[PDB]
Symmetry: C2
């Protein structure tokens, strides 16, 4: 009598949808701009989509994390000092406690893009943010953009893809719960970066992020309705680049 239904939409599907929204904002800001060399700062798994897409607009793309060419920060710094890299385009996706503005100041790109980590107002997050301190040395000397991503009329503390994924899936599970005949809806979420970088478990990371977004205990088949709900909350997400 009681049914168990997994959504066809996976967690990775939500993250990809969010990543696509963020890139489209970047692409629009870059419209009619061409590059030879692109450097992207941030963890790779959230920045990979942007890197793969920008490679069509570039001869060489560097994605730099603190752990297409993949480097940790220190290889990149030596490469920069040796004069082996000198990007026209810099995309900073590190956010809170990310790349230091003092390191950014050494570069001279044609276009500089930084992601605003702030979401809904939070006094501590607001205080910890230095997005516009990272933009200061490029203003008037480069095309500068600030990547912003918000949920329309919703609460998200940051604009991080992980944060948005979580709040999206959790809210969706609550809407699904209120449907007729539904007993509960489990949002299937995990701290993925902990699985990958602390436990170095590539296999468990792949299995966990590929899990159905929501598992539903229900008297009725609400799969299509659950999917629509999930789509509605994803479409709530709005991303754009503010030009400075």
């Amino acid at each position: 009598m009681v049914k168990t239904i997994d959504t066809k939409t996976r967690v990775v599907d939500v993250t990809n949808e969010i990543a696509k929204k963020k890139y489209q904002a970047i692409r629009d800001f870059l419209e009619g701009e061409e590059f030879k060399e692109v450097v992207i700062f941030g963890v790779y798994l959230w920045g990979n989509y942007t890197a793969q897409m920008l490679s069509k607009y570039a001869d060489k793309v560097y994605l730099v994390d603190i752990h297409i060419k993949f480097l940790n920060l220190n290889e990149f710094k030596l490469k920069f000092i040796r004069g082996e890299v000198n990007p026209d385009l810099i995309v900073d996706l590190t956010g809170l406690g990310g790349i230091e503005p003092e390191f950014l100041a050494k570069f001279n790109p044609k276009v500089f893009i930084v992601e605003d980590p702030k979401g809904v107002f939070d006094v501590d997050i607001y205080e910890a943010d230095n997005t516009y301190k990272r933009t200061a040395p490029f203003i008037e000397k480069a095309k500068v953009g600030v990547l912003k991503t918000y949920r329309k009329a919703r609460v998200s503390k940051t604009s991080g893809t992980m944060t948005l994924t979580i709040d999206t899936i959790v809210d969706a599970s609550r809407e699904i719960t209120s449907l007729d005949g539904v007993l509960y809806a489990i949002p299937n979420l995990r701290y993925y970066e902990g699985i990958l970088f602390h436990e170095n478990d590539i296999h468990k990371f792949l299995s966990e992020i590929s899990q159905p977004a929501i598992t539903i205990s229900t008297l009725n088949d609400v799969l299509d309705e659950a999917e629509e709900i999930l789509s509605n909350n994803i479409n709530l997400i709005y991303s754009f680049v503010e030009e400075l």
Copy 2:
């Protein structure tokens, strides 16, 4: 500067607290009465605590599942027909699509307790319920009670421990998210019965249910407040036995 904090309270800790609440409701209703034989219908893990606690007031306790002596339904019926079992106390925790009223009618206990699965009103859940059809053959010939469990001024579709556990942890994660400096809060939940009874994976089941209830990404040490919030939502849960 961004920290990741796990709650000390695990999912098992939350589920035990709720199960504990349900038993005390039962214990209050029985006022220290002792039985020769207790039969409890329902799944193991939500009903084991009640079985363990009632063993102090009973010579023999049977835990019957459709899957202290543990028996599945078919061993119990053959035992019942052979006349080896005839309980003074029957506790039915099966809920929706559970034990049939036609099977209950064969018994003659002194005390009969059935769990009302209904939570907040749901037309389909309400109609699928037959709790009072299970009490009917015992009304007047035994002490009859209906176990009810609600979240005060909150929405839960059923009174099931699993349902309450999910809604408790998810709501707590949302309140934690609203705290200063918190980026997000992950509710660590999984369909546990699917891991254990479908997949026969006791190892993965114990690991998943022992997960910290909530994983927090935060700028501040918010552990104590997170525990308190989690504790507060548990205290919202009210359980009692309605005597008919």
